[PDB]
Amino acid sequence: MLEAKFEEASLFKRIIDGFKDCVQLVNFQCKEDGIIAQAVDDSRVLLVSLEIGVEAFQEYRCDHPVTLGMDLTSLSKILRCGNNTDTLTLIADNTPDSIILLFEDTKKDRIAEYSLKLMDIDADFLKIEELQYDSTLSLPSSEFSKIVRDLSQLSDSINIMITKETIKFVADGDIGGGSVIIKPFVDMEHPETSIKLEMDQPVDLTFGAKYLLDIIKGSSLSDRVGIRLSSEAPALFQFDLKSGFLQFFLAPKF
Amino acid sequence: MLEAKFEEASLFKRIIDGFKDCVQLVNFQCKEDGIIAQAVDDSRVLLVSLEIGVEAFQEYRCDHPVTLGMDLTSLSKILRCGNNTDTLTLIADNTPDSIILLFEDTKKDRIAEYSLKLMDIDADFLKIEELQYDSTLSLPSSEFSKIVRDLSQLSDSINIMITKETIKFVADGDIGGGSVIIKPFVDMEHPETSIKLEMDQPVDLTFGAKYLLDIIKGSSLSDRVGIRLSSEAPALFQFDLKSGFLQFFLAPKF
Amino acid sequence: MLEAKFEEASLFKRIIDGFKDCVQLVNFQCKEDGIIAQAVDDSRVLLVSLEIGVEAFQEYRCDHPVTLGMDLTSLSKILRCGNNTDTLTLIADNTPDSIILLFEDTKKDRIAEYSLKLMDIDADFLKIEELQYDSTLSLPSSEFSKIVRDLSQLSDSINIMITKETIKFVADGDIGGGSVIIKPFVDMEHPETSIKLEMDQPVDLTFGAKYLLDIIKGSSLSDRVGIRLSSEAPALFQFDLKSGFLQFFLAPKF
């Protein structure tokens, strides 16, 4: 029997928003020490990896490994049904035909129980993360969100260029162009505005805006975003959770 | 001469919102002791009955019965023109070709006078309400609104099932399912959250969500909704006014 | 070299909103004492004239006259990229191939530099304004905005009728009609609510709502709108700036 109790349904809903507009069906491998889930879009240039530790729940019990694949188009609908700041409990019994989502609230007033029909999905799990990445920066997700949103106005292709102590986002379109530059700094008034950068080797990569716009969906999950870049491999965009994370692996072109 | 003065135009606009997305043209039978109006959608499974007593206005005068049929698509447009919290006065003279809607405000600053061309419409008024209904409950319109909106995500058909001291709204779709259960209780901290239920005989009816979504439009008119159910006849959904009401008669299928 | 520094980008963005949904490409004739710009829609019934004095900027330098034509569809996109309450600096060098838009903020945190490819556009500048107009009124832009928006619901044609101390906006549609009447008055509690009217000769003109709706876009630029009317020539709708203005010349039909 599985019983994973989110303190606030928002968390799970906001997590699903990460996968939503970029992948369809996802296997949520549940087990002893939490949940993990992976998915890849049709064109195989964006991979989303989720890990949720036990501490991210208020209560978590999984007697025995249970893999629950489900349609996120359909799951999300049920997430709409819930009350944003209400306790959500996932329930399942061995070899589920279905998973039960369970909303509660303050008073035993309205307690909604939904059920989602599950689906068999062949896995073939990937493990592409690398040991070392040529460059590794971290900035407020809100700032990174802005930069992408703005430069997306001009070009369908955003170039990220990193020399030492210099991160340059560039967009060049038929219709004009644009470029933001930021620098590392420790902000003691509020360290959550800080910009970090550990450049081992410089990088000059170009990603599709279509996907960078999907990646910034996770901005609702963490104050900061973790962007690891190397020129031979996909970039790691990571939003950290209380215990766990949401990772986006994006391959740049050319 | 007719002169019906709403204190706030919102009331009349919110009333029209009740008829709007479910019926088209409506005869507003005006007379001595107020206004009444009835309408039925194309498929004849939803009937809307309105009664507005004199006390619901701040000033009301109707010398002589005047039946004013009008296009609610067109009327609503004029209701858009008005200032939400402004006094609205309906004016008409014997055998109107048209009705005049009259907005005012605080200062004699802007005073807008609109006119709506009326239409001849054959009536055939219905009187289908019954003496006794097998079950009769009442709950906060906001709560009932939620229940319908949520379960509408999953199924195009919502089943309401009432045994003693047990009201169970159920939705079962191709894509999972859902079900809310509520109980009667007197809430003294705020009696407007109370749930009442007088079950003479149990009921197990299923209505189309399409229409239950239209019915919850009246949630802007009253804190509570009055749902009377019987298994042989259409359900009565009623939102009470200061003096009057807005009723929705809905036939369940099968 | 040109360097025009708006204190807040909003101003320039809100100015562009004036031209936006009514004209396409516009030549911004920049020179010593500021910027001016003119444009005419396809059907040539709406002409927009802008003047921005030096005092409207916080810093302005134009060594030498520079005419910069540009696509407002495309310019606006870049105006989306900026931070509403941030300093915006237009930069250009002799015979630009392009103009540079430059956002800043509080801290030297994010400083975005965009560039817009310019376009050659043949001018043929118009000077149609007249010495005297038969009638000249001024009212709160918010009020005038409302009047147009409301009466636009009913008719695609709005008639403005001015006799002495009487301004009557009228709309008459297939579906009913409407008419607002206002009077001149000095409001000492707040003179910005005042309504002025200097009628030399009466006027009875009818304009297309399509365009009056475009004209009220400038309501974001000034508290009041200046409407000058004469029966032989286009109406002057003018929203005043700190130093300058945004004018809309509209020809009435029949």
Author numbering:
A (entry chain A), B (entry chain A), C (entry chain A): 1 to 254
In the authors' words:
To better understand the role of the subunit interface in translesion synthesis and in other DNA metabolic processes, we used random mutagenesis to generate a series of PCNA mutant proteins with substitutions in either of these two β strands. We first measured the growth rate of these 17 strains in liquid media. Twelve of these strains (A112G, Y114F, S115E, S115G, S115V, S177G, S177L, S177V, G178L, G178M, S178T, and V180A) had slower growth rates than the wild type strain of approximately 4 to 5 hours. The remaining five strains had growth rates similar to the wild type strain of approximately 2 to 3 hours. These data agree reasonably well with the qualitative spotting assay described above in which the A112G, S177G and G178M strains showed minor defects in cell growth and the S115E and G178L strain showed a major defect in cell growth. We next measured the UV sensitivity of these 17 strains. All 17 strains had increased sensitivities to UV radiation to some extent compared to the wild type except G178M. We then examined the rates of spontaneous mutagenesis and the rates of UV-induced mutagenesis of these 17 strains as well as E113G and G178S. By contrast, all 17 strains, except the S177G, S179A, and V180A mutant strains, had statistically significant defects in the rate of UV-induced mutagenesis (with p values less than 0.05). A defect in UV-induced mutagenesis is a characteristic indicator of a defect in error-prone TLS.
Proliferating cell nuclear antigen (PCNA) is a protein that is essential for many DNA metabolic processes including DNA replication, base excision repair, nucleotide excision repair, mismatch repair, and recombination. PCNA is a ring-shaped homo-trimer that acts as a sliding clamp that encircles DNA forming a scaffold for binding numerous proteins involved in DNA metabolism. PCNA is required for translesion synthesis (TLS), which is a pathway for bypassing DNA damage during replication. The subunit interface of PCNA is comprised of two anti-parallel β strands: strand I1 (residues 109 to 117) in domain 1 of one subunit and strand D2 (residues 175 to 183) in domain 2 of the adjacent subunit.
